[PDB]
Symmetry: C3
């Protein structure tokens, strides 16, 4: 069975102009783009996105860093929630494995290029926060017979 | 002291049209192409290739997935049997390390893009199974002084 | 807080014509080129570079391998001394992690493409040996706000 995860390119990904490179890494595994939207993230939506951090001292600066253009994405694949986390690498780029997005592109946790859901529950919640159901597109990849066992 | 390993691009590698990208990963380390042949794998040769799995319940479906176009290859280099295995990553792509072929391209073990010999004995056996001696080409890389210590 | 490390493309990196690829890996993380110079390494400078190995049996052959064109470089970034070591990978390419320079390009320690300082003390010593302090250029990256937290 496949699942869907929420992935978001943060303002540093937009501004450093590496959006296509990020997308290509997920396409390369045969993950399917189920939704994609450019928007500008605002404090009110970011407060909900980061609801688990309410009241924490670092949240105001996090919301400031994230106030900017973002690319909202949903990718579908086998185990894609956990696998996308592995591909992004550790929160701290300096601790992330070579070959991961954060290790390959970044230096510090506050500018770490990309967000991905950390669990099935957060993926469901984040997809619903940033996308309406009518924005989620269902189609079958033509190479499915060679991607899935 | 170099050795030779048998590497085979499976039908999913052919059909997803990533043959050149796969070859480039091995060329990048200065490994030498000693043999290369496109063929369509038959159940008869696949039964011998997968002789270790004789009588197992998954073997019939494994042979079915592999009955298709394959690129047979021999690469030469220092420790290339073990090193190519490390480059491919774990059999299951989800367990493979970022930066490996299987982690970068694949989702499931039944469609994991590439085969490589797992030992000196299996390399000798697999090369002999898929290639005649006259198909193995001996030449020296012009960059040898800068590849080998 | 940023630091600077000494990175040097060895004659195999020059001769295999992968200089640009190497530079791009460090640029990709937002590391700043603070100095860059092509020279031809000579025994007298290499004896100082490898002073800690004076008298060891491998040193004469090492100096022979390293007598050739090199690209001297200083890169600046957060934790860049340790991070560049991680990006190069283990001295022995066969032990290096997939996704590192030495694992992706090399086979043996004597031809492992690149040198990087192993410590703050070594970076100061190596930068002073291979560059005049005047060749170190001060400027600020325009994308700093999206690279640094």
């Amino acid at each position: 069975h496949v699942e869907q995860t929420y992935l978001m390119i943060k303002p540093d990904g937009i501004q450093r102009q590496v959006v296509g490179e990020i997308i290509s890494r997920f396409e390369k595994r045969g993950y399917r783009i189920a939704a994609m939207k450019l928007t500008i993230a605002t404090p009110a939506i970011l407060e909900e996105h980061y609801a688990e951090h309410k009241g924490k001292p670092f949240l105001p600066g996090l919301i400031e860093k994230m106030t900017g253009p973002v690319l909202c994405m949903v990718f579908e694949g086998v185990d894609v929630i956990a696998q996308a986390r592995k591909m992004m690498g550790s929160t701290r780029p300096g601790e992330a494995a070579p070959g991961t997005i954060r290790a390959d592109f970044c230096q510090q946790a506050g500018r770490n290029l990309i967000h991905g859901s950390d669990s099935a529950e957060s993926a469901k919640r984040e997809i619903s926060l940033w996308f309406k159901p009518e924005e989620i597109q269902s189609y079958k990849l033509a190479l499915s017979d060679y991607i899935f066992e």
